[PDB]
Design a protein around this ligand. Sequence first.
Ligand SMILES: Nc1ncnc2c1ncn2[C@@H]1O[C@H](COP(=O)(O)OP(=O)(O)O)[C@@H](O)[C@H]1O
Ligand SMILES: Nc1ncnc2c1ncn2[C@@H]1O[C@H](COP(=O)(O)OP(=O)(O)O)[C@@H](O)[C@H]1O
Ligand SMILES: [Co+2]
Ligand SMILES: [Co+2]
Lengths: 384, 384
Amino acid sequence: DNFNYKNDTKIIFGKDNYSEIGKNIKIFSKKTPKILLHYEADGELIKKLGIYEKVISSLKEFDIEFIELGGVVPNPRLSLVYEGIKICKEENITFILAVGGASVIDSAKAISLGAVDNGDVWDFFTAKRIPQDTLGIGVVLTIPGAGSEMSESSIITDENKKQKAVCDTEVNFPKFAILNPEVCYTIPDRLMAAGIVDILSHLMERYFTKSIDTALSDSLIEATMKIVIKYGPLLMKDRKNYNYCSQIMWAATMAHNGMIACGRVADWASHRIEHEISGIYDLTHGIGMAIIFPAWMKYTKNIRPQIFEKFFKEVFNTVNIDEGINKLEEFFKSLGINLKLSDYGITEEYFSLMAEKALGNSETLGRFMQLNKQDIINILNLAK
Amino acid sequence: DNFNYKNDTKIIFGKDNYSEIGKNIKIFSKKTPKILLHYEADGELIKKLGIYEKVISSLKEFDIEFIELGGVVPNPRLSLVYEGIKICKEENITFILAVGGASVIDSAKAISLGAVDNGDVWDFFTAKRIPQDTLGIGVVLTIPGAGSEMSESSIITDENKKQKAVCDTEVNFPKFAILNPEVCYTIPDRLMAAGIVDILSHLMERYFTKSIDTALSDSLIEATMKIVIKYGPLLMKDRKNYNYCSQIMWAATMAHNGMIACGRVADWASHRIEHEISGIYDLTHGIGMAIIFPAWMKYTKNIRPQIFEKFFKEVFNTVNIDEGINKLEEFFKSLGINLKLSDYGITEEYFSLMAEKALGNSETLGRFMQLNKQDIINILNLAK
Ligand SMILES: Nc1ncnc2c1ncn2[C@@H]1O[C@H](COP(=O)(O)OP(=O)(O)O)[C@@H](O)[C@H]1O
Ligand SMILES: Nc1ncnc2c1ncn2[C@@H]1O[C@H](COP(=O)(O)OP(=O)(O)O)[C@@H](O)[C@H]1O
Ligand SMILES: [Co+2]
Ligand SMILES: [Co+2]
């Protein structure tokens, strides 16, 4: 149980602080700054919300020249990275400002890698070369999910060969990330509820571990989980409450922090199972993790029952696993989320297909408990 | 309640990992590495403990040339910094390895500033110039206190003018810090108990705040505090227990982390009062904070009684402040620590003197509650 931790992304947390876009662009750009403004599609969202205005007002206030590059698709495309790299070498951009979510942050990270490289940037995703430098980006985050605003990962899909790939390296760390909980206000209900489930799930996947001697870490993960459980329902019924949004958005940031997960072994069983439901049905990730995770917990309740006793004691105030599992189901339901796959017209038709696709070329799946094709179908039956 | 957070010190946490001294020296040194080895006095301690051996074995295994510079005094002296700066410019040192505690880390940080500067490094402590670069240091921490192994501060005392000063800047951040809980084993009992109090106190000084809307942050600070309260007594009676030492040493690291204190206003009333007791008597910091903090809490129990209710509920399982205060006194006593100043032959003789020296040129002192000369004497009377 040894671990390393590094994370140098500067966090700018709060509201009415839109000057720090430019103030921080100057702190991390070479000499005279000339930035590239990255956003999804044609700024429809960020301009609708007023993020576009407040951004330009910050660059102007700081005399920061800038070009705009738009047109990100949810799974961002290497053809657009190739474009941004061209403009950054052509127009001498010294810094990229990602305004959006992980789809445009990942483009920002990919463009920032090849703007400084003299070769193909796909060599950095297909494991040919290990990038040693990046131009540098700052993020203006619009939705508190995934955590790409402080990760070292970038996920680009090359459509011409259809192979999606990633690149994990310490140079991908955004130089700063602007974190205003107000951006939560405009998010649609079902999207925000699923985002709450994503935070809790990210915490649970590291919490439920066969690792030992992790008491401080247990507490910190419990404390964050507990906050998501108290404030998640409140934010859902009072969507413009800055307090409620500060807790949830700060919980999500912490959820992506390996100071509180101290090299404890995460289990991705639920993620993988959910992935396959989402590959065949049009179902949002967070909603699928509210349906799958309680089923997975039921199936794995015998592995380490004490760590299940602990979870429901510290988080739901009950040493009864069954009562605690139903409380967690009730919590999901209080977010608007129906708890069964039948509810979403999903039938047992492809349970078998999804189980084999989950497993791929392996016999079992998971770390907390090793799950084979039938195990995975039993879990999908618990969730029907 | 907006805040910023940056911290890029790489944490290497664990044991039987002494290769990472050299492995990490190579990761952060320019081209060919030639390091300076910094330690207190003549390596008596670190060599006695076997840290010296295991270090040299790592530099050799990695072909790392190195000179040794010793002779740190607990309050490190600018005359020695001046020496180390000379050797770093003379002998072309590309990196400093601080092996010790905050006394030698602060020398390491000061030497690392002027090895790269073309002027006097005291200009960086006396607020004349703001350093913009540092050579770079890695720490091998021997005692989990103060947190200098991940701070941006360096505290040097110039003895020829007797003025002590500090320099706070993002370049002071160690490039890495080696954190092995085993180094806790050899620490004397009273020194380790006081170090446990220092962690709890660092957490309490930020916890007890007039700031509002800090629920997630409250939980994280509570979780850490609670761990210090559970494991601190156990580590005291089982000094070679790696688990117990991992929790406490990881609690101390987290205690110095502003991810869990989200720009909440800290109060230094207890620190300042304790400082003056320690200025007149030969009394260790941690012991003085076990005597002062319960007195300060008694005196300030009426400011924000709900945040006192909360503290003792989440940390001691009681909504009674009095019962909770006595529990905290009992906790200190379970660390070997006597709870009164009379016990240490300290009398009311200089309560008046210490109160004026605490206050300096100000009328009151503290943020949670503004404390004037008589307030401070009342608190010293509670602690007699
Ligand atoms: N502040 C916001 N308000 C409303 N909708 C948003 C906001 N931020 C993102 N979205 C929406 O969420 C959808 C998908 O989220 P995305 O931006 O890809 O972030 P992530 O990849 O982190 O989930 C987008 O179609 C976008 O319309
Ligand atoms: N691992 C250790 N084992 C025993 N004693 C230690 C250890 N590390 C430091 N000390 C002792 O603690 C005393 C003061 O601590 P110091 O090294 O100045 O660290 P800090 O300044 O962080 O408290 C020193 O005299 C030293 O003898
Ligand atoms: Co997940
Ligand atoms: Co203190």
